[PDB]
Design an enzyme around this catalytic site. Structure first.
Site, PDB file in Angstrom:
ATOM      1  N   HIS A  83       0.857  -1.169   0.000  1.00  0.00           N
ATOM      2  CA  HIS A  83       0.000   0.000   0.000  1.00  0.00           C
ATOM      3  C   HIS A  83       0.907   1.238   0.000  1.00  0.00           C
ATOM      4  CE1 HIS A  83       0.495  -0.419   4.472  1.00  0.00           C
ATOM      5  NE2 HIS A  83       0.118   0.834   4.593  1.00  0.00           N
ATOM      6  N   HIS A  85       1.568   3.888   1.987  1.00  0.00           N
ATOM      7  CA  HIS A  85       2.312   4.490   3.123  1.00  0.00           C
ATOM      8  C   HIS A  85       3.860   4.323   3.022  1.00  0.00           C
ATOM      9  CE1 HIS A  85      -1.525   4.383   5.843  1.00  0.00           C
ATOM     10  NE2 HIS A  85      -1.465   5.465   5.092  1.00  0.00           N
ATOM     11  N   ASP A  87       6.242   2.884   5.047  1.00  0.00           N
ATOM     12  CA  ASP A  87       6.831   1.574   5.354  1.00  0.00           C
ATOM     13  C   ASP A  87       6.708   0.557   4.232  1.00  0.00           C
ATOM     14  OD1 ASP A  87       4.100   1.929   6.253  1.00  0.00           O
ATOM     15  OD2 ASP A  87       4.230   0.016   7.344  1.00  0.00           O
ATOM     16  N   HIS A 148      -6.814  -1.542   6.414  1.00  0.00           N
ATOM     17  CA  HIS A 148      -5.881  -0.568   6.925  1.00  0.00           C
ATOM     18  C   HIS A 148      -5.790   0.649   6.002  1.00  0.00           C
ATOM     19  CE1 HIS A 148      -2.037   1.095   8.400  1.00  0.00           C
ATOM     20  NE2 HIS A 148      -1.648   1.058   7.142  1.00  0.00           N
TER      21      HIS A 148
HETATM   22 ZN   LIG Z   1       2.075  -0.596   8.410  1.00  0.00          ZN
HETATM   23 ZN   LIG Z   2       0.024   1.879   6.393  1.00  0.00          ZN
END
Ligand SMILES: [Zn+2]
Ligand SMILES: [Zn+2]
Length: 231
Positions: A83, A85, A87, A148
């Protein structure tokens, strides 16, 4: 045997062999004065390697490639970010400079761009609707639905019955919700149930952060997300 934060000085990366031709990579970052571990995956693809997710930043991701060369010694040819983000995409530029072909769904690429994050080169078709799966070398990529994040993917390794949930799946020690800024709490249990439905045979389930376990991590996550919903 699975490594935890106190084993891993910040900037270093550990590999953990899960099964034949399947590893997790584990790295750490400081956030708000706490240190968090983060998992990704490495899957052998003949005489090459497929990487799932960066090691959460440029320096970590450089260290990741260095550790792979030291310990496995096969070329990372492709990477998939699960995804948008940091990280997961943070370090894509390091991968790209090193000649790794970077991939994500077009939903992820778009969200990364909006966030001002690094943007994988290639766009993965066939993952736009909840329940969609595609083979990508030695893994299956599955879009379970929003959880998430609206774009989150999970990765299954059929040779090894390894399921990498990324940040849609919490480790057992996580009792309260993580970052849910971008979450679809309404849909997250429904998405987790699609995972269970598609991968009931999974033997090893790897959370985005922390210790692997089994399919018990799915209902654990649902319990935590539902509690957070009713907070
Ligand atoms: Zn994460
Ligand atoms: Zn995330």
């Amino acid at each position: 045997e699975y490594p935890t934060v106190s084993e891993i000085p910040v900037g270093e990366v550990r590999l953990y062999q899960i099964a034949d031709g399947v590893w997790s990579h584990i790295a750490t970052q400081s956030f708000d004065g706490a240190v968090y571990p983060s998992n990704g995956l490495i899957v052998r693809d003949g005489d090459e390697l497929l990487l799932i997710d960066t090691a959460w930043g440029a320096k970590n991701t450089a260290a990741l490639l260095a550790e792979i060369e030291k310990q496995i010694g096969l070329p990372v040819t492709r990477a998939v970010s699960t995804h948008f983000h940091d990280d997961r995409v943070g370090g894509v530029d390091v991968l790209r400079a090193a000649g790794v072909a970077t991939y994500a769904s077009p939903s992820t690429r778009r969200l990364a761009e909006v966030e001002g994050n690094e943007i994988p080169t290639h766009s993965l078709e066939g993952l736009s609707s909840s329940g969609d799966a595609v083979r990508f070398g030695p893994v299956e990529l599955f879009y379970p639905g929003a959880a998430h994040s609206t774009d989150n993917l999970v990765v299954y390794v059929p040779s090894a019955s390894v399921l990498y949930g990324g940040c849609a799946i919490y480790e057992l020690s996580r009792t309260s919700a993580g970052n849910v800024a971008d979450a679809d709490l309404a849909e997250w249990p429904t998405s987790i149930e699609r995972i269970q439905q598609h991968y009931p045979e999974a033997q090893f389930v790897i959370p985005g952060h922390g210790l692997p376990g089994g399919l018990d991590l799915l209902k654990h996550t649902t319990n935590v997300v539902k509690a957070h919903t009713n907070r």
